Amino acid sequence: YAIAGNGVRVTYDADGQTITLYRTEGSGLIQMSKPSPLGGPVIGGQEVQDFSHISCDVEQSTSGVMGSGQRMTITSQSMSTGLIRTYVLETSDIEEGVVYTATSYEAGASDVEVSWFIGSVYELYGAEDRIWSYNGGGEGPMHYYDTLQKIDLTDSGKFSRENKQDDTAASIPVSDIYIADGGITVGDASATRREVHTPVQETSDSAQVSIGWPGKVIAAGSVIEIGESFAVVHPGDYYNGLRGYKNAMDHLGVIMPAPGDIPDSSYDLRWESWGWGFNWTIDLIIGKLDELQAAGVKQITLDDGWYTNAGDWALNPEKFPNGASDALRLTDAIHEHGMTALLWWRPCDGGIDSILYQQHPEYFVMDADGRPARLPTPGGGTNPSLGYALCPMADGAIASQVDFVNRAMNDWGFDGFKGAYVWSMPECYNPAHNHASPEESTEKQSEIYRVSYEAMVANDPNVFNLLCNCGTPQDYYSLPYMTQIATADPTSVDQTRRRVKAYKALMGDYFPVTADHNNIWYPSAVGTGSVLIEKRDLSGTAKEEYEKWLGIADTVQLQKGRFIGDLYSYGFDPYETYVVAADGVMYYAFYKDGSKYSPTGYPDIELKGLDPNKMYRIVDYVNDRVVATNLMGDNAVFNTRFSDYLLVKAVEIS
Ligand SMILES: [Cl-]
Ligand SMILES: [Mn+2]
Ligand SMILES: [Zn+2]
Numbered sequence: 061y062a063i064a065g066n067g068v069r070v071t072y073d074a075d076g077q078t079i080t081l082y083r084t085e086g087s088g089l090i091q092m093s094k095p096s097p098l099g100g101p102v103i104g105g106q107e108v109q110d111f112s113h114i115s116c117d118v119e120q121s122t123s124g125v126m127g128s129g130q131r132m133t134i135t136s137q138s139m140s141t142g143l144i145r146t147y148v149l150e151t152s153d154i155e156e157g158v159v160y161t162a163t164s165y166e167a168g169a170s171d172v173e174v175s176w177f178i179g180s181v182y183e184l185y186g187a188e189d190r191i192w193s194y195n196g197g198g199e200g201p202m203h204y205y206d207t208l209q210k211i212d213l214t215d216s217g218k219f220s221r222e223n224k225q226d227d228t229a230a231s232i233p234v235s236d237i238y239i240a241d242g243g244i245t246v247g248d249a250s251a252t253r254r255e256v257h258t259p260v261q262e263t264s265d266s267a268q269v270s271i272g273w274p275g276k277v278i279a280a281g282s283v284i285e286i287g288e289s290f291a292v293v294h295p296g297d298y299y300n301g302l303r304g305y306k307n308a309m310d311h312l313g314v315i316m317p318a319p320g321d322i323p324d325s326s327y328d329l330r331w332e333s334w335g336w337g338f339n340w341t342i343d344l345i346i347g348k349l350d351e352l353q354a355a356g357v358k359q360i361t362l363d364d365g366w367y368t369n370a371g372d373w374a375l376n377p378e379k380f381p382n383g384a385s386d387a388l389r390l391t392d393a394i395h396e397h398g399m400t401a402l403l404w405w406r407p408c409d410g411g412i413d414s415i416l417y418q419q420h421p422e423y424f425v426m427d428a429d430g431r432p433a434r435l436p437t438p439g440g441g442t443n444p445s446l447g448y449a450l451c452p453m454a455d456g457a458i459a460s461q462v463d464f465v466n467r468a469m470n471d472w473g474f475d476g477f478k479g480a481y482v483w484s485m486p487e488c489y490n491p492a493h494n495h496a497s498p499e500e501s502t503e504k505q506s507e508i509y510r511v512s513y514e515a516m517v518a519n520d521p522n523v524f525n526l527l528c529n530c531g532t533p534q535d536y537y538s539l540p541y542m543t544q545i546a547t548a549d550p551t552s553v554d555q556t557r558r559r560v561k562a563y564k565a566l567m568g569d570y571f572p573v574t575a576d577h578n579n580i581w582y583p584s585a586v587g588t589g590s591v592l593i594e595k596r597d598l599s600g601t602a603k604e605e606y607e608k609w610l611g612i613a614d615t616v617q618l619q620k621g622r623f624i625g626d627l628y629s630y631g632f633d634p635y636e637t638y639v640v641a642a643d644g645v646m647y648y649a650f651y652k653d654g655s656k657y658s659p660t661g662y663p664d665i666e667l668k669g670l671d672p673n674k675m676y677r678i679v680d681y682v683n684d685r686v687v688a689t690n691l692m693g694d695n696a697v698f699n700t701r702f703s704d705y706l707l708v709k710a711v712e713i714s
Contacts, residue, residue, distance in 0.1 A: 065151025476524025587649025
């Protein structure tokens with residue numbers, strides 16, 4: 061039993077009750093998964109594993125979620141439970157590498173209490189010494205746990221991560237595992253946020269990626285759909301898998317902004333007002349504008365510390381002694397220097413000592429004990445800077461967000477927003493909200509982002525909007541409403557660079573991403589095709605260095621170029637490598653300073669994706685030096701010494 065789509069084959073063995081995935085390669089196939097068992101329900105702590113094969117219907121010519129393609133419907137039965145499983149797989153004639161999966165269960169004479177449903181499980185075929193993994197979970201750890209994780213098959217440990225999305229985790233419902241020959245992405249096939257895990261688990265000689273959802277009681281005689289997923293078989297690294305997921309999710313209406321609709325100002329070099337921490341003043345910021353303008357900065361963020369309280373989002377009298385006229389003198393000064401002005405906020409936070417909470421507690425999430433629920437950190441808990449959660453289904457909560465947007469734009473003259481330091485949304489038990497279930501607040505969190513952004517756009521279609529779920533992958537369902545992504549408080553060059561590639565994969569090759577400013581890593585920012593930002597008040601050689609790198613970024617403008625993620629595979633090509641095409645020229649960035657993947661010795665640099673019949677001069681555009689005088693496009697291999705990074709362009713020779 062088999063179905064085919066563009067670049068993928070799926071086979072089912074009725075005896076073993078296993079699925080095997082293949083991808084196309086040249087005129088053949090590469091096996092991507094081992095024969096993998098179908099996912100089952102978990103009852104009393106145990107996966108049910110007495111399912112037997114009933115039937116497998118292949119339809120070679122049909123139309124599904126992704127349009128025309130093929131379908132395989134597998135029916136199985138469990139004598140012990142009375143459950144009949146229907147497992148549906150769909151392929152697409154057009155969508156490369158993608159398999160859509162949906163499962164339902166029917167109960168027999170007795171109700172069945174399921175604690176969890178394992179949807180699909182794929183163990184990688186052909187792994188050797190390591191597997192690289194993309195982990196979209198929102199459970200933390202915050203900041204210092206890499207989203208990209210190496211699963212070492214030669215060490216003592218066994219990698220295991222759940223990758224959760226729930227009331228304490230709001231990130232990206234996707235995981236990928238890959239090797240030299242490519243990999244397998246699994247992601248939640250839902251147009252809206254729901255509770256899901258995409259676990260990544262090392263096995264005896266490989267690793268497996270899976271997806272699953274919370275259980276429920278299946279009433280006797282009833283049929284229920286328990287969850288739907290996309291799988292992507294792909295060559296190369298996580299970028300190819302994540303791009304497949306992006307393409308798949310278009311069919312569910314989760315559509316990221318098209319290049320033509322992204323505002324110019326979302327590609328601009330930006331400085332953010334942290335030069336004095338919480339001790340910024342309006343005049344300190346204004347005092348920097350002449351030098352920032354001269355050096356090529358076109359955008360300014362008024363960062364944290366400007367407001368009385370979250371929720372209220374009123375001007376702090378200490379920072380704005382003259383009220384709104386002070387906010388205006390700030391944004392006017394910014395505008396007079398040819399720049400746009402952004403304002404920091406924390407969406408979903410209604411404060412604790414806010415007027416908002418005092419006057420309108422009914423707008424807030426209520427916990428199971430009847431108390432106001434705090435906004436959670438990743439994996440649970442809160443922190444002192446996070447207030448009470450606004451319930452996304454309370455009209456007054458949403459209106460308070462819209463009113464802030466309108467005030468900041470129309471009264472204070474701001475041109476956009478930097479949302480930050482918020483993660484998931486607690487479950488709500490307020491009976492006045494008439495929730496379908498308590499998880500409804502969590503599921504609808506993204507409504508706050510959507511409605512806020514729609515209000516922003518009504519004031520100015522070129523408004524900037526960014527949300528940093530700091531130290532975690534961004535809330536996937538916020539992504540449609542953004543004009544720029546930050547890599548989100550990365551704590552290393554490895555984190556910032558590898559995340560640029562992930563977000564490009566999910567958002568589009570022209571979608572603006574910034575490498576952020578947690579540490580000074582100008583070469584990382586430029587070479588990945590990211591927007592270079594900064595927050596420090598610099599002097600001496602550090603100031604010179606910023607000016608230098610602004611100059612470079614403003615010359616090559618790779619932030620506006622077409623990111624190319626499919627030529628090099630992170631962890632398998634000799635260097636951590638990034639590629640951008642800008643104004644018809646190929647730019648390459650090779651790094652060795654990322655301790656998570658850095659070569660022994662001095663491997664040759666290979667430039668991929670050039671015209672095989674053309675000759676190129678390879679120019680280090682940072683130092684303005686030729687590193688290779690003439691390479692043919694079909695053998696663009698050279699060796700040059702560099703300690704940390706090499707940023708080059710391939711200039712065609714005529
Ligand atoms: Cl990472
Ligand atoms: Mn291991
Ligand atoms: Zn509520």
